[PDB]
Design a protein. Structure first.
Lengths: 53, 54
């Protein structure tokens, strides 16, 4: 059906666009900082062992 | 001979300090408390190799 009040194609495209933008931000932050663990949300056990090391 | 024994005892205490203080993030290695620890190298469970530190 061709309807004007809804766009599921646009909704899906937005969902993957934000998924790609969030991954883009994460990689940019790892490149500038030089660390792959900038927060516990990256890898918690790695943050604790790396902090103790 | 006593003078040489002084450096023997200093070095012997040096070995015990190395054994008791060497660690990997607080995990003592050389004092014998490490014993045997298995390292999981594999994409599925049950594939690990036993490293023994004495």
């Amino acid at each position: 059906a061709v309807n004007v009040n809804t766009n599921v194609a646009a909704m899906t495209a937005q969902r993957y666009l934000t998924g790609a933008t969030n991954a883009q931000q994460t990689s940019m932050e790892r490149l500038s900082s030089g660390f792959k663990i900038n927060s516990a949300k990256d890898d918690a056990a790695g943050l604790q062992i790396s902090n103790r090391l | 001979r006593v003078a040489i024994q002084e450096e023997i005892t200093a070095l012997n205490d040096e070995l015990n300090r190395i054994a008791e203080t060497t660690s990997f993030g607080g995990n003592k290695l050389l004092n014998g408390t490490f014993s045997t620890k298995s390292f999981q190298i594999g994409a599925d469970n049950g594939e690990a190799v036993m490293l023994t530190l004495k």
